[PDB]
Structure 1
Amino acid sequence: SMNPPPPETSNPNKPKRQTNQLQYLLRVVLKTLWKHQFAWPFQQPVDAVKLNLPDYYKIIKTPMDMGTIKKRLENNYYWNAQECIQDFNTMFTNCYIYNKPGDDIVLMAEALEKLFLQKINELPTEE
C-alpha cells in the first residue's frame, strides 16, 4: 500500500546523447500527449496512497509515467529514442494490465496511445 521510490531520472554515470530523434520525442511526442485533456492521470508517478490503490505496486513492477519521461527528456537521461519509446509503452501497458477493459483510465491511455503511435510513425530519420 506504500509508494516505492520513483523510477530513476538522474544518473551521472549513465552515458547520454542529445539527438534529433530524442529532440522529437520531447518537442513533438511528449508535448502532444502532455497538453491533451486526458494527460492528467499520467503526469506523475501513480500515488497509490492518494488514489487508494493498495495493490498497484504489488502488480506493477516497472512503473512509468509522463512526469518521469518529461524529466528524463529535459535532463538528457537517454542514450537513444528506443529507450524513451519503451518508457511510453511501459506506461500504457501498466495501465492496461492494472485496470479493467473500458475503464475511464484505460480509454484515456488508449487516446494518448493513438496520438503516440501517429507521432512515432513519423519519427525523423537519424541525422
Structure 2
Amino acid sequence: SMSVKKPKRDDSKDLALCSMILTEMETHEDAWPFLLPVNLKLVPGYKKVIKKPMDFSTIREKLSSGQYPNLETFALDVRLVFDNCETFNEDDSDIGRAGHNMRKYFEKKWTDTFK
C-alpha cells in the first residue's frame, strides 16, 4: 500500500531475456504456423472467429518498440498465439500438434528463466 512495498525484484534483464525466449520459439522447427499473421483475406472464417489474432512477428515488433509494459503482458501474447491455434485447429492435425508442442516448449523456458 502507500509507502509499503515488497522488496524490489530486478526486472532490468527482462527485455533481453524475453527476446532470447522469442528467438528460441522463432527457430523451433514447429514454429511455421505461427511466424506470420494468418492471412485474413485467404483463410475463411478466421477474421470473424478469432477476435484477437497474434503471431511471433507481431510479438517481435511489439517487443522491439516498447509496447510490452512488463514480462506478463509478453507471456499473455505468446499464450494468445496458442489459444487461437486451439480455437481454430483440430488437435489431430499438423498445426494442432504444432501448437501443443510450442506451448509446452514456451512454458518450460518461461519457468526455467523466471520462476
What TM bracket, shorter-length normalisation? 0.7 to 0.9
Cα deviation, residue 124, structure 1: 3.3
Q: Which residue of structure 2 aligns with residue 66 of structure 1?
A: 56
Higher RCO, Cα 8 Å, sep 6+: 1
TM-score by length of 2: 0.83
Alignment of 1:20-99 (within 5 A): 20-27=13-20, 29-49=21-41, 52-99=42-89
Gaps of 5+ in 2: 1-10
Aligned amino acid, residue 19 of structure 1: S
Cα deviation, residue 71, structure 1: 0.9
Is 1:113 aligned to 2:103, yes or no? yes
Cα deviation, residue 84, structure 1: 0.5
Q: Which residue of structure 2 aligns with residue 15 of structure 1?
A: none
TM-score by length of 1: 0.76
Percentage of matched positions with identical amino acids: 30
Return the structure number with greater helix share. Answer: 2
Q: Please give the secondary structure, in 1, of the residue aligned with 2:30.
A: coil
Contact 1:48 1:56 in 2 (8 A): yes
| Number of positions where the alignment pairs a residue of Structure 1 with one of Structure 2 | 105
Aligned amino acid, residue 26 of structure 1: S
Contact 1:60 1:94 in 2 (8 A): yes
Please tell me the root mean square deviation across aligned C-alpha atoms, in Å. 1.6
Q: Which residue of structure 2 aligns with residue 4 of structure 1?
A: none
Gaps of 5+ in 1: 1-17
| Shift >3 Å, 4+ stretches | none
